[model samples]
Target: SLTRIDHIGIACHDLDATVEFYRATYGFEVFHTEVNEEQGVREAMLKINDTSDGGASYLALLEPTREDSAVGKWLAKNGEGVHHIAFGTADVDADAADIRDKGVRVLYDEPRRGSMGSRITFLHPKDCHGVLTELVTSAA
Candidate 1:
């Protein structure tokens, strides 16, 4: 089951500068940061409170750290901006299977390790109405 929207990712040339912009303008706090070599970028997770439920937490201002990475390429083509939106799922594998069965284009054949120890898979934006979607399942 999909739980809630986790966060929105943004691609940027510099993570530190982007983080500073979000902090100074919106007062968002950086909760986590990581580098994903497989995906070829660094990232920062900002905490945004949308509800009282801890599991239902929201986030903003996730920025990438590389210019030649996937996100970096996206930035080059589309400019620095919103990269992707992630949704929390109780069973990522099952959700991915269902998505494929529904004719949705999946980027990953199976769930891959994502930031904060979550299993993740991406859905192609072309099949998703032009918005890239990430399905995330927390490691238990």
Candidate 2:
């Protein structure tokens, strides 16, 4: 089962500006940042609050690396807003198989590298009630 909310992804045209906006407006700071070329995104994770549990929630800022990238296409069609929400899972492969068996479309046969070196796969938005969902697993 999906354990907890991993992060809420926000697609934006300008990464630095959006990060600064969160810092200035919401008092959130970047906890981690990286360029995932394979996914074609320049991204940053901002912690929303502190937690006693090991798991933490975040707002993941995503900027497309190129025009043909997924984020780019999404932005082109939908402007900027909440792109997707990720759930933390112990076994993404198992969850993917389960979701696929239930008739939800899994985006990949194998999990791809996500931010912070996590394994990730997407469930089609149509199958997820119009919200793009990502199942993520890490060595937590």
Candidate 3:
């Protein structure tokens, strides 16, 4: 079962510039940043105090390193914007299996290391009618 919205990922061509923009404009705190070689992108996490009735407490900024990478290709085609929304789960691997059993095409059959020590798996946008989805669980 899904727990809550983990974070919303934003795809960007420039990591530093985007980070600066958010910092200067919204005064959002940069909680963490890292590069995932497997994903070929640099990512930053910004902490946003929960305000929406059912919103989570943070957002993530994802910057692509290469034009051919997943985030990079997404930016090339759709321009810079929100890429995907992640939902928390108790066990990402089990959740992925259950999703696949229900006929949803999971992008990753197994959970992989993600930001903030979380395990994550993606669902192809095609399976969800163009909205890429992610299932995540805390590494702890």
Best by TM-score: 2
Q: Whose lDDT is greatest here? A: 2
Predicted candidate 3 versus true structure: per-residue lDDT over 13-45, tens digit per residue: 788899999999989879889889889889998
Work out candidate 3's RMSD over C-alphas.
2.6
> For model 3, which pairs clash?
none
- Estimate the overall C-alpha local distance difference test score of candidate 3: 0.84
Go through the candidates in order and give the clash count of each: 0, 0, 0
Off by over 4 Å in 1: 50-68
Residue 6 lDDT in model 3? Answer: 80
Write down the TM-score of every candidate: 0.89, 0.95, 0.90
Candidate 1 lDDT, 9-52, residue by residue in tens: 77777788989988999998788887788887777888786533
TM-score of 3: 0.90
Estimate every model's Cα lDDT from 0 to 1.
0.79, 0.91, 0.84
Model 1 lDDT, residue 104, Cα: 92
The residue pairs in collision within model 1 are none
Regions more than 4 Å wrong, model 2: 50-53
